[PDB]
Amino acid sequence: VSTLIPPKVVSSKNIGSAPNAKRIANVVHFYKSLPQGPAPAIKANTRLARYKAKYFDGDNASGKPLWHFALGIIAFGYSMEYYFH
Amino acid sequence: SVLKNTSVIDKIESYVKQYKPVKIDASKQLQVIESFEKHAMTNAKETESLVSKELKD
């Protein structure tokens, strides 16, 4: 004889179907993350890492590193050809 | 005063005099209504707490 109780029965009722499914996905995606640009890790110098933080950086990454690599390759090849040819 | 040869006004007067206590009033809404209400506030506070923490989340 008791009336229905919508706001009293919300323990099992969630927000539709998709919103409750994505609530767990969105609650923790924003929890454990850097606030703003933390840990840049820019500093690196290990020849390969020296190239990474010197010319191979993605801020520009223009053809200048490629031209420098080609210049070094042809400089080595000149001596190689002198040895061979 | 309207009736002269009544012969019945005393009988009806006595009948109403003996009829006013018809029976004891029930006033016993305290066996299933009380249990329904107890469950009502219990799980209602539970739902209030859960919706509150969901809002904070």
Side-chain angles (χ1 to χ4, degrees), chain A residues 1-22 24-35 37-41 44 47-85, chain B:
Chain A
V1 84
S2 154
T3 75
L4 318 93
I5 34 165
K8 148 75 162 207
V9 182
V10 81
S11 310
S12 166
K13 182 242 176 229
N14 236 310
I15 323 169
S17 272
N20 54 266
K22 63 213 294 281
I24 168 178
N26 57 59
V27 61
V28 303
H29 266 223
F30 312 134
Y31 268 170
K32 38 212 185 285
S33 151
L34 79 175
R47 166 149 263 278
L48 298 112
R50 176 257 312 155
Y51 219 156
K52 187 108 191 210
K54 183 197 65 146
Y55 266 55
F56 271 6
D57 210 90
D59 70 283
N60 55 287
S62 71
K64 197 70 71 73
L66 309 183
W67 307 332
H68 287 9
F69 197 90
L71 173 64
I73 284 310
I74 195 76
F76 161 69
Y78 255 115
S79 85
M80 196 23 47
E81 203 78 276
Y82 295 155
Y83 164 60
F84 253 92
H85 199 71
Chain B
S1 38
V2 191
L3 319 93
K4 257 186 274 216
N5 56 277
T6 86
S7 78
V8 80
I9 193 164
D10 38 357
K11 170 252 150 191
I12 182 50
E13 182 77 10
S14 35
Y15 220 100
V16 200
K17 284 304 144 302
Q18 64 89 36
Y19 186 78
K20 312 170 196 270
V22 279
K23 69 219 78 174
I24 183 67
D25 192 281
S27 201
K28 58 219 204 299
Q29 53 277 307
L30 262 80
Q31 81 298 347
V32 63
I33 295 100
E34 279 337 281
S35 167
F36 285 176
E37 273 163 11
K38 295 314 161 288
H39 178 274
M41 320 67 68
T42 66
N43 190 25
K45 305 163 210 308
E46 186 260 15
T47 51
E48 288 156 54
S49 92
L50 69 92
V51 300
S52 76
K53 57 210 203 203
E54 171 71 25
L55 279 159
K56 323 293 185 209
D57 166 44

